[PDB]
């Protein structure tokens, strides 16, 4: 996260760290959506241009974390993957369209002050909240700059950007399964997601029921926090049918 701040304890208790077993390192962010399902970006798990193709046994999920590098005894929980599900129409060849994946945990994780699931939007919440200028929040342990790495989880709040501005900011083909967020050069303030923040959640707090909903997944960008560029997010609500289908078919 670029130009963010340290998170408060328990501020994002749905934050998941995807962790490579050997060599032991951060791979991506992710989110807890129930006691056995974690949501992330497909590209975290599969990206052939970079010879990335992870299997369940390559990985661990670490939940309840604050500190990036530290083992957070008595607080974080570490879970094994039972199964990975990548969107069957994830477009890794071109623009990361449908950049979404589910991970099923071997055993249910125990909720705590630091571990709690985020909500997934229903149609009405998404219609009401996914509007240009409305702010969401992104969190992660990714790079602090586009060139270091943070000691603890970082947070930044960012305004959704109008689709023609998103489109005119890049040469990549943008789809209805994406949205972009960030400040305009004129707006002064700044901030963005960056490498390492991938797969983490873009959340909004519903003013109707004061619950947090995950509207986006950190997906892609060109550089980090560049003037005139915006971060792109997987549009969770648009891909919801596939999400429920997977959880319904594989419980």
């Amino acid at each position: 996260i670029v130009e963010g701040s340290d998170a408060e304890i328990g501020m994002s208790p749905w934050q998941v760290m995807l962790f490579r077993k050997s060599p032991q390192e951060l791979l991506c962010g992710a989110s807890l959506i129930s006691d056995r399902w974690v949501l992330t970006a497909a590209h975290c798990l599969l990206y052939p241009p970079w010879d990335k193709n992870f299997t369940e046994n390559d990985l661990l999920v670490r939940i309840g974390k604050h500190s990036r590098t530290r083992y957070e005894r008595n607080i974080e929980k570490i879970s094994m993957l039972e199964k990975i599900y990548i969107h069957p129409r994830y477009n890794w060849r071109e623009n990361l369209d449908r950049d979404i994946a589910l991970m099923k945990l071997k055993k249910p994780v125990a909720f705590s002050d630091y571990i709690h699931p985020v909500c997934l939007p229903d149609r009405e919440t998404a219609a009401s909240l996914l509007q240009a200028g409305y702010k969401g929040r992104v969190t992660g342990w990714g790079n602090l700059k586009e060139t270091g790495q943070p000691s603890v989880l970082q947070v930044v709040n960012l305004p959704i950007v109008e689709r023609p501005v998103c489109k005119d900011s890049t040469r990549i083909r943008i789809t209805d399964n994406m949205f972009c967020a960030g400040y305009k050069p004129d707006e002064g303030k700044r901030g963005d997601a960056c490498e390492g923040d991938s797969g983490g959640p873009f959340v909004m707090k519903s003013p109707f029921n004061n619950r947090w909903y995950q509207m986006g997944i950190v997906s892609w960008g060109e550089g980090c926090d560049r003037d005139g560029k915006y971060g792109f997010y997987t549009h969770v609500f648009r891909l919801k049918k596939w999400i429920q289908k997977v959880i319904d078919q594989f419980g």
């Binding site: 390192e25 951060l26 661990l60 590098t69 083992y71 790495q149």
Partner: peptide, 10 residues
């Protein structure tokens, strides 16, 4: 690398 080792159990 900069990461603290996790319990071998995981």
């Amino acid at each position: 690398g900069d990461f603290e080792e996790i319990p071998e159990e995981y």
